[PDB]
Structure formats: structure tokens, C-alpha cells
Amino acid sequence: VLSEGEWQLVLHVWAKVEADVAGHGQDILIRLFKSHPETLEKFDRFKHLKTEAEMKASEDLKKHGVTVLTALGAILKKKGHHEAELKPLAQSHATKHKIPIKYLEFISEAIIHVLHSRHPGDFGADAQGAMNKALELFRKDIAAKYKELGYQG
């Protein structure tokens, strides 16, 4: 459970993300894809991309990055009271996209990395810790829905 102070650190850097959601999404998905190639394989939509330049040029990838970050921002703004937002997501990711919880840990790490590169002044160690907690809560809650559905893992 994040404290109010922690939530404030989280949403303060997230307000910064909102200035350029598309650029953040592309950086995050590209980082995810490059660092963990097995993740790109889950995307029939994007598996034709072989290089970072191709990824950076993809308008559809940028479009999905916005979809992803928009869903995550709505979750973060609920400050833990994200039951309704998390349900559709867990259902599709477990049963439809078949995304292991480990891959959610990978994108969390890509998120934290990109937030740090783009917002050093509002992403000091305290903010990083707070964001990590927020992302851990998200994973924890998603994981519980996965287990229920028979996909824990």
C-alpha cells in the first residue's frame, strides 16, 4: 500500500509523461522489445519489426504505446482503487494475449527506465521507489486475477 506521499511522487512524474504520451510509449515498447525480445513475439501486430529504426518509424507502434500508457495512467490515477480498470486488462492479457506476469515486470522496468531518462528532476530515488511500488501493486493485483483464471505465471 503506497502512502499518499508515494502516490504524489508517482502522479507528479506521470503528469510529465502526459506532455508526450506518444514519445514515452514508443521509448517504452522499444526498450521492452530490445531488452526482452520474447515480448515482441507476443505481438503479431509488431513482430515484423526487426530493428530499432523500423520500430521508431512505426506509426502503429506509436499508436499502441499511447493505448498502453493511457490505460496505465488511468490505473495510476486511481491510486490503488483500480479494480474496474484491472479486470478487463487481466482478462485479455491472461486469456487472449497470453502475457506472463514476468513480461509485466519487464515493461515496468522499461517504464521506470524511460521515466528516469526523460524526467531526472522529477524522478529522483524517492520517485523511482514510489513508481516501483505502484508498478508492483499493479502486478500484484493483475497476478491475483491471473491466478483466479488459471494463468498464475
Annotated binding site for nitrite: 64
Q: Is 87 in the site for ligand HEM (CB under 6 A)?
A: no
Please report, for residues 72, 113, 151, the alpha-carbon distance to residue 89 in angstroms, rounded to integers and kept in the order given: 10, 23, 14
- Which of 49-57, 76-84, 93-101, 114-122 is the region at the interface with ligand HEM (rule: CB under 6 A)? 93-101
Q: Which of 147, 94, 144, 134 is nearest to 4 (CA)?
A: 134
> Is the Cβ–Cβ distance between 67 and 92 less than 8 Å?
no
Q: Given candidates 68, 114, 127, 134, which one binds ligand HEM under the rule CB under 6 A?
A: 68
Q: Looking at residues 36 to 55 of the shown chain, list those that interact with ligand HEM (rule: CB under 6 A).
A: 39, 42-43, 45
Q: Is 29 in the site for ligand HEM (CB under 6 A)?
A: no
Cell digits of residue 56: 521508431
Name the site residues for ligand HEM (rule: CB under 6 A): 39, 42-43, 45, 67-68, 71-72, 88-89, 92-93, 97, 99, 103-104, 107
